[PDB]
Write a protein that binds this ligand. Structure first.
Ligand code: CL
Ligand code: NA
Length: 119
């Protein structure tokens, strides 16, 4: 198949991302600025270390760091990944967002469910 993640993904500065040393307050502020609620989380090496959702952070202390509330990130894709395979897993496992990473697991951005389903 010719349709890959590269053609559909959203770079991290467009979609949004959090640092593991950011706080729950920073997450709530990003939700209102970006109108999205699920973000990849990176460490100081730019490596994806988790994902943060409203289920993870909504009821937490605003002062708490993201590394202490974030969820595990197991589904990761690359630029060459087939969109058909991504859609199959997003449907079967009910994902809204999947982080896009380089071979060294550093963050490039995300693919969203609406973009995958519409294309
Ligand atoms: Cl998700
Ligand atoms: Na947005």
């Amino acid at each position: 198949d010719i349709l890959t993640v590269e053609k559909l993904y959203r770079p991290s500065h467009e979609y949004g991302f959090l640092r593991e040393t950011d706080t729950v307050k920073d997450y709530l502020d990003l939700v209102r600025k970006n109108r999205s609620s699920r973000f990849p989380v990176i460490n100081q090496h730019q490596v994806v270390v988790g994902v943060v959702t409203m289920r993870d952070a909504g009821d937490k202390s605003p002062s708490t760091t993201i590394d202490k509330v974030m969820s595990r990130s197991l589904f990761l894709v690359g630029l060459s990944t087939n969109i058909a395979n991504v859609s199959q897993r997003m449907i079967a496992e009910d994902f809204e967002m999947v982080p896009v990473v380089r071979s060294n697991q550093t963050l490039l951005g995300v693919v969203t469910r609406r973009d995958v389903m519409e294309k």
